[PDB]
Design a protein around this ligand. Sequence first.
Ligand SMILES: *[C@@H]1O[C@H](CO)[C@@H](O)[C@H](O)[C@H]1NC(C)=O
Ligand SMILES: *[C@@H]1O[C@H](CO)[C@@H](O)[C@H](O)[C@H]1NC(C)=O
Lengths: 416, 424, 418
Amino acid sequence: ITKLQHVGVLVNSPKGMKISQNFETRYLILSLIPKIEDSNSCGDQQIKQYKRLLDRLIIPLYDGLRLQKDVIVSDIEKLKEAIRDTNKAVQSVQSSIGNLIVAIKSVQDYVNKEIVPSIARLGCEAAGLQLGIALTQHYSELTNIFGDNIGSLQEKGIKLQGIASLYRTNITEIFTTSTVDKYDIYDLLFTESIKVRVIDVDLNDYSITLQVRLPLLTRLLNTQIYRVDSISYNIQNREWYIPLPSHIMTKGAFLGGADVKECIEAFSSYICPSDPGFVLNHEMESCLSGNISQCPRTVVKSDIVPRYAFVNGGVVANCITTTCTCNGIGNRINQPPDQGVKIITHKECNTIGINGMLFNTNKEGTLAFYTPNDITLNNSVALDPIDISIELNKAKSDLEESKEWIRRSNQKLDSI
Amino acid sequence: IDITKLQHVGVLVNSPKGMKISQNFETRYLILSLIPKIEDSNSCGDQQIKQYKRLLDRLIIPLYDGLRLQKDVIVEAKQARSDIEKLKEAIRDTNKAVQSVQSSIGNLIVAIKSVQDYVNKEIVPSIARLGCEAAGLQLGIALTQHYSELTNIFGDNIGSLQEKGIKLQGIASLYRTNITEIFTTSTVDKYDIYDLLFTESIKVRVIDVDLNDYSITLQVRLPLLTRLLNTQIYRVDSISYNIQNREWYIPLPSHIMTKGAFLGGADVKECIEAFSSYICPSDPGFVLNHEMESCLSGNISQCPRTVVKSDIVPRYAFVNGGVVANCITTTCTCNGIGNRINQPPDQGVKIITHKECNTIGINGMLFNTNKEGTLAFYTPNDITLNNSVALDPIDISIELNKAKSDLEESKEWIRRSNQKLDSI
Amino acid sequence: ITKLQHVGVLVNSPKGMKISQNFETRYLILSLIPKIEDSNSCGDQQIKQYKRLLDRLIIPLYDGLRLQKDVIVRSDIEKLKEAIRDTNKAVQSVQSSIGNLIVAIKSVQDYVNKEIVPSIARLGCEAAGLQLGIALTQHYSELTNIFGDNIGSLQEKGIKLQGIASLYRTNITEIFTTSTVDKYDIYDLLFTESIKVRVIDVDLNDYSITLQVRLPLLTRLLNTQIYRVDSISYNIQNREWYIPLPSHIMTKGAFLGGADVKECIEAFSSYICPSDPGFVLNHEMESCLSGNISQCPRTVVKSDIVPRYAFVNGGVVANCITTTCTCNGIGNRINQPPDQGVKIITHKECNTIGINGMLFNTNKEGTLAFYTPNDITLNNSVALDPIDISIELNKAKSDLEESKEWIRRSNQKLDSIG
Ligand SMILES: *[C@@H]1O[C@H](CO)[C@@H](O)[C@H](O)[C@H]1NC(C)=O
Ligand SMILES: *[C@@H]1O[C@H](CO)[C@@H](O)[C@H](O)[C@H]1NC(C)=O
């Protein structure tokens, strides 16, 4: 193959080829509910809910798997009575205290029979809740990664975060049987060739078993696949055009056309189920190879034949039959008899125009943001600590006085 | 430029549609922040933030590693005898009785102080903590939701190096009110952006991940469609037809193109059918051969027809809901095996409408109309909240009342005590 | 059709054919917010929040549909009393204390009643709220998984198993409710995700989404069979030939032709086309494919581009005359009588078939892998040892009982005056 632009054919993006036939099969077990242990069974009510949620997920995948399997397979006396009085007075101050004690005891038992237990329960409920958040973030994450896999019983690609559960810290380690290039796995990701299919579901453990099949690419020696676009071209005052296949191949010193219908284009090569090459008729064969005298050219008489095509950042066109402008509809672009087409470059003309149609360079837009609302956690609800010191301090202060008077009553009681 | 006389020759050209080329793009960055600024001086949600960040790490890291791999490949006292000693003693005893009572008070004004301490040093901070753990939970839910929402909208993009389309809710952050503000660079039709949505032509690739601030950076590529002036595209199906007792069929491309006054075929292969038009990277058209072109333009006597001898050649086709068959070499039964629909040896084919015959018949096969089935629902089970009932308050009044009730009765007696003591 | 392996054409996997034109429309109603019954409005905020979340999800779908419809349409007796007055003043001071105590006590009570009890209930409320949020959050999560792909585009999309889950109750057959469908037919519908659902209408007030499920009804063509065919360069005598043929072939009754399965979708037991994909081949080829092998449009090969080997049913078919086929190692070459056109290499005959050094092995199995969540263990609530003052309280009655006795004593020493 050469440079037969002068005849309107443009061969570009040269690329290698690999055949995907061999593969490694690993199985991945998804466990939907973590081993949960809570002594007092606080997170009990919640576990129950999280399971009914899982069932709504698992059960359908089950019924489906079962269907698939189903098909496939009177003076002293005054002082006397004055004592009796004061005495009866002390006896009542007793029953008084005898009641403050009961009152005080009742308070204790309240605090123990109601308040403390409540505080307890509340915490239990809140421990349970804390678990709900946990399970929920799990179900969330679970579904986001293997959600499309758990939804169909057919093969599917696998997200990066799903592959991340196959290797520890080096993606290469995904293949635990062979050794693989950094390069080779990249072609796998960019192509999403790694496929996953759900094989079974255990309704009791709440686990889904997936079968992933990793392709092992076989590289091909000396094979290159190019893309080709043909445009009309002028020679003297006549316009010609050569229709050719979309892709050309090169195996050793042989060339032919490549049918990439079933393949997938990777970064530096195409990964195919099998060699895509096919033979062209001697004419195209010689034309492409160099003997330009053989090109299957046709005189163009219809507006249908394309007179321009886009190639790697820029346009290729027949500027004789198509009006090519440079940076405005007033700057006509010439093309010497020398060639059959002109390669207008965006470096050359920022806005290259073809028959009025303006083709510019990617225009940056205004930056966008996906942002959540700022959350401020207005702390709990505070309670002012109770204060009785002022009262208790007086009780203890009267108390003392009481003692002093008794002290005095005794030294006065001294009359020997 | 195409005569629909072609119909009489079993060749049907479906609906007309325009064509647009996609070569002008509008790059535009979208920054995803997976964690909001959080304010809580008491650090009551520290444990959740931790939990949340770890959740994001599991999600983000793989995207990160993948981008790195790509970036790499690419680039006792005496006793009382006399009654005055008996009084001295009698009162000396009561003093001790009082001294006992005051001993009892000391014990109570300790029992109370202990309560004022149990409550203050334990019942309170304990309750305070519940609210603090509860604030954490509040933030968890929220944070959990932001994740669930984020993963839904961008989870398809976040999980691949390959380019993907944006969901409606994704695009939602590219405009404030009109879905048009989508493009900032240019001005675009309601029609032009509808073809974009309907086709999922708007695509985005993840560019960089920032593991520290927990943010992903997407590049949205909005394409700008160039409408190809006076170009239409039709889909074309061909059936067999009878003309003078001979049965013919014409093999024709799937699609045809109309450019000005020229015509040919359309290789829509690498293109995408939208609503108003097809959207292709380049012009799909190619040139048919003299015979075929002429045939389609009108010179019906040029059609590369063939005699049907096999049963492979289609004798009917669905187009415009209804059916179009060759009712001569086929038996078209209108509304039930009974009534047969006839076709003069003159015409080419018969166009049967589901309006005339509710259930078209073609040799046993009954092509009917969409039949509506039973309305179905996806509804969550009704929820009801049973806020814990309040706690019957504490009542120690009956006890406090008798308590004060006596304190008076006591004061009384001391009056009488002081009374008799005053008449001495 | 036959056994044309002798000329290098390999007719693979034989499948039947069904066309899909008869559809069964069925509407599905998505309710994003369930009916909530909260008497004391404990979950108010949490609900206002969830809705704010459903809006950031619904709205866009709305704005989207709008754009669409918008476009589509100084003695002893004197001494004795100075001492009793003293005693009384001491009893007075006691009463004063008992008062400051009776006060302090009610105060305690009031606090627990006017500040703690309430505080306990509020906390109880906040939880009921938080519990609702868990629910709502989950619902949102579950629902965005099932229909989130549909809700995000306005083009038709397939439907997940768990999505189909709400069309039937027990048998997956009750999916269609206007006809009766083979278990076989729905499996082809599932295996193909032919069932499509398109978002029809959204309601911003009741937070609901209406979806239309399009359920295809397959019609089966008789005696029709579609085969996949591969062609490889063969070797007859010392000359090397190649016969190029279409990728798919069809068999109808006693006739055969090609098949343009392009617009078609291969299922399990058959292909599901929007219409019969058969076309006729030129006499020569038609004849060739039916036995008359002297009619095969064979071409002499002179390039390495012509396929000399092909993958088939977990094995390889190759021209081991123009290709160097090795069985179980590069030293063991496989031969071929100048007669047969090609050799059918089986992985059972060759664990590792090698074509020109390129190795095609059996499939090895890597290590089982696990996606498991860290073990969660709940450290119970926060427990408070109960309050205990029964010690200090007993030291109270006891002292009163001592006091009671000191009085009983003081009385009798008086009961003996005279
Ligand atoms: C070009 O091809 C023709 C036909 O095969 C041959 O006769 C002629 O000599 C060739 N000339 C070149 C360019 O080698
Ligand atoms: C097919 O082969 C027969 C003999 O098997 C031969 O006589 C005949 O000419 C061939 N058919 C055609 C179309 O000529």
